[PDB]
């Protein structure tokens, strides 16, 4: 395992050193998005939570394509506000229910240290 906790204060610094293989070592789901919501990275823990195969969703748009249940003010709305403002750090619970058994998670969205990409971190609750 990679030794970093969900919701860590400096998580964007710690994850700046991870290629796909190291992200796969996290204890929680990690998705990196560009400012439009396109998936840049998607780790193994996330695939275990939601069933998606990482290489099949990278390059897709998370809000339009992969996760329409997140296309709402309560999720995408927060994301887009953060992309627009150029800062994002929000944690909230949510239920993922598209083509899957509804699964309650805790989500932490945080702007990456890199200028315009955004993490979506997920763990079960
Ligand atoms: C709602 O449509 C949620 C979908 C979803 C969330 C997270 C994933 O890893 C994959 C799909």
PDB file of C-alpha atoms and ligand atoms in Angstrom, residues 31 42 46-47 49-52 57 62 65-71 75 94-100 122, ligand 1:
ATOM      1  CA  UNK A  31      -9.789   9.832 -10.026  1.00  0.00           C
ATOM      2  CA  UNK A  42      -8.515   6.283 -12.295  1.00  0.00           C
ATOM      3  CA  UNK A  46     -11.885   3.112  -7.400  1.00  0.00           C
ATOM      4  CA  UNK A  47     -12.510   0.291  -9.837  1.00  0.00           C
ATOM      5  CA  UNK A  49     -15.663   0.363  -5.406  1.00  0.00           C
ATOM      6  CA  UNK A  50     -17.629   1.067  -8.550  1.00  0.00           C
ATOM      7  CA  UNK A  51     -16.782  -1.809 -10.894  1.00  0.00           C
ATOM      8  CA  UNK A  52     -15.354   0.280 -13.686  1.00  0.00           C
ATOM      9  CA  UNK A  57     -12.892   5.120 -18.471  1.00  0.00           C
ATOM     10  CA  UNK A  62     -16.924  11.672 -15.829  1.00  0.00           C
ATOM     11  CA  UNK A  65     -20.482   9.645 -19.736  1.00  0.00           C
ATOM     12  CA  UNK A  66     -19.248   7.608 -16.765  1.00  0.00           C
ATOM     13  CA  UNK A  67     -21.107   9.027 -13.797  1.00  0.00           C
ATOM     14  CA  UNK A  68     -24.343  10.751 -14.853  1.00  0.00           C
ATOM     15  CA  UNK A  69     -25.629  10.346 -11.294  1.00  0.00           C
ATOM     16  CA  UNK A  70     -23.025  12.967 -10.378  1.00  0.00           C
ATOM     17  CA  UNK A  71     -24.302  15.411 -13.009  1.00  0.00           C
ATOM     18  CA  UNK A  75     -21.519  16.997  -7.264  1.00  0.00           C
ATOM     19  CA  UNK A  94     -22.974  10.711  -2.108  1.00  0.00           C
ATOM     20  CA  UNK A  95     -24.597   7.627  -3.582  1.00  0.00           C
ATOM     21  CA  UNK A  96     -23.325   6.112  -6.792  1.00  0.00           C
ATOM     22  CA  UNK A  97     -26.179   4.307  -8.499  1.00  0.00           C
ATOM     23  CA  UNK A  98     -25.647   4.191 -12.254  1.00  0.00           C
ATOM     24  CA  UNK A  99     -25.757   0.661 -13.644  1.00  0.00           C
ATOM     25  CA  UNK A 100     -24.701  -0.624 -10.218  1.00  0.00           C
ATOM     26  CA  UNK A 122     -13.776   8.110  -2.895  1.00  0.00           C
TER      27      UNK A 122
HETATM   28  C1  LIG B   1     -23.148   7.864 -10.890  1.00  0.00           C
HETATM   29  O1  LIG B   1     -23.589   7.826 -12.059  1.00  0.00           O
HETATM   30  C2  LIG B   1     -21.866   7.435 -10.428  1.00  0.00           C
HETATM   31  C3  LIG B   1     -21.056   6.729 -11.237  1.00  0.00           C
HETATM   32  C4  LIG B   1     -19.701   6.385 -10.995  1.00  0.00           C
HETATM   33  C5  LIG B   1     -18.973   6.928  -9.938  1.00  0.00           C
HETATM   34  C6  LIG B   1     -17.664   6.589  -9.712  1.00  0.00           C
HETATM   35  C7  LIG B   1     -17.018   5.666 -10.527  1.00  0.00           C
HETATM   36  O2  LIG B   1     -15.810   5.225 -10.240  1.00  0.00           O
HETATM   37  C8  LIG B   1     -17.696   5.186 -11.644  1.00  0.00           C
HETATM   38  C9  LIG B   1     -19.010   5.540 -11.885  1.00  0.00           C
END
